């Protein structure tokens, strides 16, 4: 009798999706990640500056 | 506006896979403008179409020293309403994108020439000076150049004043 | 002076209905159909009548 | 909005009986508790084949009866009509059963009791069978009306003009014959 | 006054074609039309007898009979709002076999095949069509093929 | 009558079940999207040190939001902007993106906008504006418990997981979105970012193909 929006209230988020309390408390929009980096390229800088 | 790279295939036939593979400097808004314009410069170069083909990558380019002020020269075929003409424009700005963008301004301006009509043939910062042939880029490349903002002027964001308005500078 | 032809709404009238297909049937009549074959099909499907008579036996 | 198809389409079924018949609107009331709650396919037939119009409705000779009988395996089945059932005196033998009908003619009620079975009406028919078990609904022929002949008239189909009277002298002429022009 | 004969506005649709004239190729007469078989429908000047109308030429039927020089077909014809069934009289010269029922009796030969061969090897088959799809990601390679830098072209003269 | 507060018992039991076996999905898909994400981009960047040009892969999906309102539309993009099913104006779709389906959208080019959207786009819609069709009827998709009635016999059960058959487009594609009733998107919380609405992407208007830029629009508009 009421349309929620399940992106207000959290109760009915949690309605839906149990993984939201995971993905809310361990945050994951945030994953730091990575890593040490490789490679630059080669040509992919020459073609590309040109 | 921005200078994307778009890069472009055409498709791989059997009989001849691995093309040839194309690259163009788009001044273009975004991704997508991009890859019309590339597009529909490459439809005026081989005979591959959207369709008949693929975009390979866009890279989007940045000026590689975007705070050092640079004569560009800009080469531009436009097209009137009678015919259509080439150009050689100067521009005196600090990036390939700023040029670009003031110069479809210039065009607009001069020639009331829309964006749809100019075609950037190519771009490229001047190194000497001499180089530079239009006087109006050559008046700010004067050894010391220092001048005046004459009748200075006032956004007041009242209505009224009381002071009685100065062009003092 | 009054005005003489058109199709003007012609088609759009048309599309109020459906454009109804035929609808198609198994068994289409056969009337028209070349008469020495008709005659025969006639005598081939008394023949295979009795012959599902005398399979149930 | 782009309406795809009219909107506010009606039913284009009776959902109730344009009849105004009291008791008839008990034996819906009852029907259509029943196709409801029971979700047997059966009731929800009846429960239509009583709103139907008496056009809809025609009567089912006790000698159809008879022959819905004569099917395979339904020897024993208990004949529900909705609609009149008629008396017919071309058969003789008609054999001992239950049949539910609206209504039967005093003719055809006579001609069932006679044999030793059993006249029957719908709620009756439903104390016996709710879910209708071992009924076996048999339809008047409906395509054969004095009307349904003149409907779809026309080059060449083959059907009934309309006509008060007769035979010669009227619409045997012109368009009816190689003879005056051409037929039809 | 105004013209709507048999023939009306034939002038290039019964034209015989270019250096294809006079006798016609005899395996058209051979090829065999049962009942069912889908033909479309060639005009063929040459033969004037049995020749359709030509509303029909391009359309594409079924034949409902066969006799001693000719099929029917019958073709259903759009007409105002309702397509009436109509049932030609056309000889074979005017007929050609439908092509897209042959490719047709094809796949269904394949997809029996498809079928017979998996479900006696492990079941899994995917053996209906399906539209080309969004192509797939890959690498391609610069080496050997260094991308050229093309420009849009000044504007000379032709 | 009696007993019936056992089951209560009884079956809060089998969805607390339920709710852990959606959950552990969820778990997964989320693995799922992160790496699938991350795969693209390694594949970018390992192929761009070896010389080679790693191209991404055609949009899968593709989602059609109505721009133009109904009522001077021709009768061939009429009809097909109604086998899309964008019989409003302001209204969505997800089309699986074949050949034939890019045909579908060639057609229709200047009354809709289209673009490849982001499960984030996909999530937003679904969990905001995302009805069923639930015996023809605009049922909302409030409760997961629903969803998994309708859909249960190709899987999909919960919201989220016929999230997943859109946005990855599973082979229940068909079904989940002639479930999911066409969105009923408002118009665009910024505005069109244009004057001229009717117009396309390389002329500022807002209709036909615009790759990426409809994830920015439609998290607008929904």
């Given at each position: 009798?009421?349309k929620k929006?399940?992106?207000?209230?959290?109760?009915v988020?949690?309605?839906l999706?149990?993984?939201?309390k995971?993905?809310a408390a361990?945050?994951?929009?945030s994953?730091?990640?990575d890593?040490?980096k490789?490679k630059?390229?080669?040509?992919?800088?020459?073609?590309?500056?040109? | 506006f921005?200078?994307?790279?778009v890069?472009?295939?055409?498709?791989p036939?059997?009989?001849?896979?691995?093309?040839k593979?194309?690259?163009?400097?788009?001044?273009?808004?975004?991704?997508?403008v991009?890859?019309?314009?590339?597009?529909y410069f490459l439809?005026?170069?081989?005979?591959?179409?959207?369709?008949?083909?693929e975009?390979?990558?866009?890279?989007?380019?940045?000026?590689?020293?975007?705070?050092?002020?640079?004569?560009?020269?800009?080469?531009?075929?436009?097209?009137?309403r009678?015919?259509?003409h080439n150009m050689y424009?100067?521009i005196?700005?600090?990036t390939?994108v700023g040029?670009?963008?003031s110069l479809?301004?210039?065009?607009?301006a001069?020639?009331?020439?829309r964006?749809?009509?100019i075609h950037i043939?190519?771009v490229?910062?001047l190194?000497?000076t001499?180089?530079?042939?239009?006087?109006?880029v050559?008046?700010?490349?004067?050894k010391?150049?220092?001048?005046?903002?004459?009748?200075?002027?006032?956004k007041?964001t009242k209505?009224f004043?009381?002071?009685?308005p100065?062009?003092?500078? | 002076?009054s005005?003489?032809?058109?199709?003007?709404?012609?088609?759009?009238?048309?599309?109020?209905?459906?454009?109804?297909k035929?609808?198609t049937?198994?068994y289409?009549?056969?009337?028209g159909?070349?008469?020495?074959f008709?005659?025969?099909?006639?005598?081939a499907?008394?023949?295979t009548?009795?012959?599902?008579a005398?399979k149930r036996? | 909005?782009?309406?795809?198809?009219?909107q506010?389409?009606?039913?284009s079924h009776?959902?109730?009986?344009?009849?105004?018949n009291v008791?008839?609107?008990l034996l819906?009331?009852l029907?259509?508790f029943?196709?409801?709650?029971?979700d047997?396919?059966?009731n929800?037939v009846?429960?239509k084949?009583?709103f139907?119009?008496?056009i809809?409705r025609?009567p089912v000779?006790?000698?159809r009866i008879?022959?819905?009988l004569?099917?395979?395996?339904?020897?024993q089945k208990?004949?529900?009509?909705?609609?009149?059932?008629?008396?017919?005196?071309?058969?003789?033998?008609?054999?001992?059963?239950t049949?539910?009908?609206?209504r039967?003619?005093?003719?055809?009620?006579a001609?069932?009791?006679?044999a030793?079975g059993?006249?029957?009406?719908?709620?009756?028919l439903a104390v016996?069978?709710p879910?209708?078990?071992?009924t076996?609904?048999?339809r008047?022929?409906r395509?054969?009306?004095?009307?349904a002949?003149?409907?779809?008239?026309?080059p060449?189909?083959?059907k009934?003009?309309?006509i008060?009277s007769?035979?010669?002298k009227?619409?045997?002429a012109?368009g009816?014959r190689?003879?005056r022009?051409?037929?039809? | 006054?105004?013209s709507?004969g048999?023939?009306?506005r034939t002038?290039y649709?019964?034209?015989?074609?270019?250096?294809?004239?006079?006798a016609?190729?005899?395996?058209?007469?051979?090829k065999?039309?049962?009942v069912?078989?889908?033909?479309?429908?060639?005009?063929?000047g040459?033969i004037?007898?049995g020749?359709?109308?030509?509303?029909?030429?391009?359309?594409?039927?079924?034949?409902?009979?066969?006799?001693?020089?000719s099929?029917?077909?019958?073709?259903?014809?759009m007409?105002?709002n309702r397509?009436?069934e109509?049932?030609?009289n056309?000889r074979?010269?005017?007929?050609?076999?439908s092509?897209?029922?042959?490719?047709?009796?094809?796949?269904?030969?394949?997809?029996?095949?498809?079928?017979?061969?998996?479900?006696a090897?492990?079941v899994?088959?995917?053996?209906?069509?399906?539209?080309?799809?969004?192509?797939?990601?890959?690498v391609v390679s610069?080496?050997?093929?260094?991308?050229?830098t093309?420009?849009?072209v000044?504007?000379?003269?032709? | 009558?009696?007993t019936?507060?056992?089951?209560?018992?009884e079956?809060?039991?089998r969805?607390?079940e339920?709710?852990?076996?959606?959950?552990e999905?969820?778990?997964a898909?989320q693995?799922?999207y992160e790496?699938?994400?991350?795969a693209v981009?390694?594949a970018?960047?390992?192929?761009k040190?070896?010389?080679?040009?790693?191209?991404?892969?055609?949009?899968?999906?593709?989602?059609?939001?109505?721009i133009?309102?109904?009522?001077?539309?021709?009768?061939k993009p009429?009809?097909?902007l109604?086998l899309?099913?964008?019989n409003q104006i302001n209204?969505?779709?997800?089309?699986?993106?074949?050949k034939a389906?890019s045909?579908?959208?060639?057609?229709i080019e200047?009354?809709v906008?289209?673009?490849?959207?982001?499960?984030?786009?996909v999530?937003?819609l679904?969990?905001?504006?995302?009805?069923g069709?639930?015996?023809k009827?605009?049922?909302?998709?409030?409760?997961?418990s629903?969803?998994?009635?309708?859909?249960?016999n190709?899987?999909?059960?919960?919201?989220?997981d016929?999230?997943?058959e859109?946005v990855?487009?599973g082979?229940?594609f068909k079904?989940?979105?002639?479930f999911?009733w066409?969105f009923?998107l408002?118009?665009?919380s910024?505005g069109?970012?244009?004057?001229?609405?009717?117009?396309?992407?390389?002329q500022g208007?807002?209709?036909?193909?615009?790759?990426?830029?409809?994830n920015?629009?439609?998290?607008s508009?929904?």
């Amino acid at each position: 009798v009421q349309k929620k929006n399940p992106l207000k209230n959290k109760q009915v988020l949690l309605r839906l999706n149990p993984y939201a309390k995971v993905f809310a408390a361990e945050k994951l929009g945030s994953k730091k990640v990575d890593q040490a980096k490789i490679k630059p390229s080669a040509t992919a800088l020459e073609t590309l500056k040109h | 506006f921005k200078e994307y790279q778009v890069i472009g295939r055409r498709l791989p036939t059997e009989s001849v896979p691995e093309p040839k593979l194309f690259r163009m400097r788009i001044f273009a808004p975004n991704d997508v403008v991009a890859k019309s314009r590339y597009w529909y410069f490459l439809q005026k170069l081989h005979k591959v179409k959207k369709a008949s083909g693929e975009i390979v990558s866009l890279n989007v380019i940045s000026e590689a020293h975007p705070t050092t002020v640079k004569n560009f020269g800009v080469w531009v075929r436009y097209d009137s309403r009678s015919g259509t003409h080439n150009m050689y424009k100067e521009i005196r700005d600090v990036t390939r994108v700023g040029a670009v963008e003031s110069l479809y301004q210039d065009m607009a301006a001069r020639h009331r020439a829309r964006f749809r009509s100019i075609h950037i043939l190519k771009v490229v910062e001047l190194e000497k000076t001499a180089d530079v042939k239009r006087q109006y880029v050559k008046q700010f490349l004067t050894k010391d150049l220092k001048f005046p903002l004459p009748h200075r002027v006032q956004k007041s964001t009242k209505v009224f004043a009381y002071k009685r308005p100065t062009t003092f500078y | 002076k009054s005005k003489n032809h058109t199709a003007h709404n012609q088609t759009k009238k048309a599309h109020r209905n459906g454009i109804k297909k035929p609808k198609t049937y198994k068994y289409p009549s056969l009337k028209g159909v070349d008469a020495k074959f008709r005659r025969n099909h006639r005598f081939a499907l008394h023949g295979t009548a009795k012959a599902l008579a005398a399979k149930r036996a | 909005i782009d309406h795809t198809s009219k909107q506010h389409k009606r039913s284009s079924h009776r959902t109730a009986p344009k009849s105004d018949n009291v008791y008839l609107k008990l034996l819906v009331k009852l029907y259509a508790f029943l196709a409801r709650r029971t979700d047997a396919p059966f009731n929800k037939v009846i429960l239509k084949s009583l709103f139907l119009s008496k056009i809809n409705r025609p009567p089912v000779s006790v000698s159809r009866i008879s022959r819905a009988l004569k099917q395979e395996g339904a020897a024993q089945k208990t004949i529900v009509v909705v609609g009149t059932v008629t008396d017919d005196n071309r058969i003789f033998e008609f054999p001992k059963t239950t049949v539910a009908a609206l209504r039967f003619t005093a003719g055809a009620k006579a001609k069932i009791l006679k044999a030793g079975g059993e006249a029957i009406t719908l709620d009756q028919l439903a104390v016996r069978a709710p879910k209708g078990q071992n009924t076996l609904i048999v339809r008047g022929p409906r395509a054969s009306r004095e009307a349904a002949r003149h409907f779809g008239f026309g080059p060449h189909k083959g059907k009934a003009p309309r006509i008060q009277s007769t035979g010669r002298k009227f619409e045997r002429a012109r368009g009816r014959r190689r003879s005056r022009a051409f037929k039809v | 006054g105004k013209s709507h004969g048999y023939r009306s506005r034939t002038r290039y649709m019964f034209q015989r074609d270019f250096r294809k004239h006079g006798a016609i190729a005899l395996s058209t007469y051979m090829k065999v039309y049962k009942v069912g078989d889908i033909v479309d429908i060639k005009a063929n000047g040459s033969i004037h007898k049995g020749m359709p109308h030509k509303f029909y030429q391009g359309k594409t039927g079924v034949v409902y009979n066969v006799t001693k020089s000719s099929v029917g077909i019958i073709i259903n014809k759009m007409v105002g709002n309702r397509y009436l069934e109509k049932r030609l009289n056309l000889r074979v010269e005017h007929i050609k076999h439908s092509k897209c029922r042959q490719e047709f009796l094809e796949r269904v030969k394949s997809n029996a095949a498809k079928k017979a061969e998996a479900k006696a090897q492990g079941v899994a088959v995917q053996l209906k069509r399906q539209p080309a799809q969004p192509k797939e990601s890959r690498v391609v390679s610069t080496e050997g093929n260094v991308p050229q830098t093309l420009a849009p072209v000044p504007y000379e003269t032709f | 009558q009696k007993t019936a507060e056992q089951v209560a018992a009884e079956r809060v039991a089998r969805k607390a079940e339920k709710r852990a076996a959606i959950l552990e999905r969820n778990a997964a898909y989320q693995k799922e999207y992160e790496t699938a994400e991350r795969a693209v981009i390694d594949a970018k960047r390992e192929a761009k040190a070896n010389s080679s040009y790693y191209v991404s892969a055609e949009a899968k999906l593709v989602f059609v939001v109505r721009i133009k309102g109904i009522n001077k539309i021709p009768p061939k993009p009429r009809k097909v902007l109604q086998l899309l099913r964008l019989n409003q104006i302001n209204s969505g779709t997800f089309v699986k993106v074949t050949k034939a389906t890019s045909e579908l959208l060639k057609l229709i080019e200047p009354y809709v906008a289209y673009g490849y959207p982001s499960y984030s786009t996909v999530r937003q819609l679904v969990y905001k504006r995302g009805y069923g069709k639930i015996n023809k009827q605009r049922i909302p998709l409030s409760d997961n418990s629903i969803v998994e009635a309708n859909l249960g016999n190709y899987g999909i059960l919960s919201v989220d997981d016929l999230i997943h058959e859109i946005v990855t487009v599973g082979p229940h594609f068909k079904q989940a979105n002639n479930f999911l009733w066409p969105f009923k998107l408002s118009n665009p919380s910024g505005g069109w970012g244009v004057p001229r609405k009717f117009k396309h992407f390389i002329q500022g208007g807002s209709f036909g193909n615009r790759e990426e830029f409809i994830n920015k629009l439609v998290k607008s508009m929904n």
